[PDB]
């Protein structure tokens, strides 16, 4: 069998590439990667066509994650092929709740990734205008949430 | 001004990610990578959410290629935004020509990547059912074809 999770942010160059990479690493360490199809996408068209933010790549290198992405925009079909859509902030939740109420098939559950954080830090905030530490913060949030999310399966 | 190309195969884990990263390298070598939007996608949905075949991931690693991809399916809007859709085999071509006539706005020129081969190896066979040498052959094909394609424009 297979479960499916799509991590969504605004641009798909900082947060969601990291969440994707952290969840893939986490299901590889647990030896469950055979049963997970994992992707990430953007709500907007700003950064489609681009690689991850280098601060994110270097943050992922720091934890031995082989991040591997080209930014893409979320589609209509993603709401049908993915069991969970996990986003970063209320703004993503707002936009995705709109498009979910305007689609021919909506299998996905649309939730905040931060809603799984044991520490209850609800928002994973865009680190694009921060420094390398803002990216490490996001990686810690993603790891905490991704572990809870996995636990509850 | 800015140009763009989409590399398409069946699942987007074997040939097309290689072609994608090969082309991305040799536009960077030519110092024209600012003027290119580069990506790859699948005709089907089976492999969506997977990283590239680890064999190909090894092939790229052996030629110093930074492959960074998760599989995605081609979309309506890919046909509208991409200047080129270069595919691998007649099945891709067949399926892409049909979808191209089924969208309201098709910018993309759909060709076989192999049609650019100076050696005239027109089909880039799927290496999925073979070994590491089958990925080396696809690489060398993508290398020939991408060069000749960039030299066209």
Curated annotation (Swiss-Prot), chains A, B:
One Pfam family in the UniProt entry: LMWPc
Active site: residue positions: 9 (nucleophile), 15, 126 (proton donor)
Enzyme Commission number: 3.1.3.48, 3.1.3.2
Free-text tissue specificity from the UniProt record: Widely expressed with highest levels in brain and liver and lowest levels in muscle.
Signal sequence interval, chain numbering: none
GO CC annotations, alphabetized: cytoplasmic side of plasma membrane; cytosol; sarcolemma
UniProt catalytic activity: O-phospho-L-tyrosyl-[protein] + H2O = L-tyrosyl-[protein] + phosphate; a phosphate monoester + H2O = an alcohol + phosphate
Molecular function as annotated in GO: acid phosphatase activity; non-membrane spanning protein tyrosine phosphatase activity; phosphatase activity; protein tyrosine phosphatase activity
Regulation (activators, inhibitors): Inhibited by sulfhydryl reagents.
Highest rank taxon of the organism: Eukaryota
Family affiliation: Belongs to the low molecular weight phosphotyrosine protein phosphatase family.
Name by which UniProt lists this protein: Low molecular weight phosphotyrosine protein phosphatase
Gene name tied to this protein: Acp1
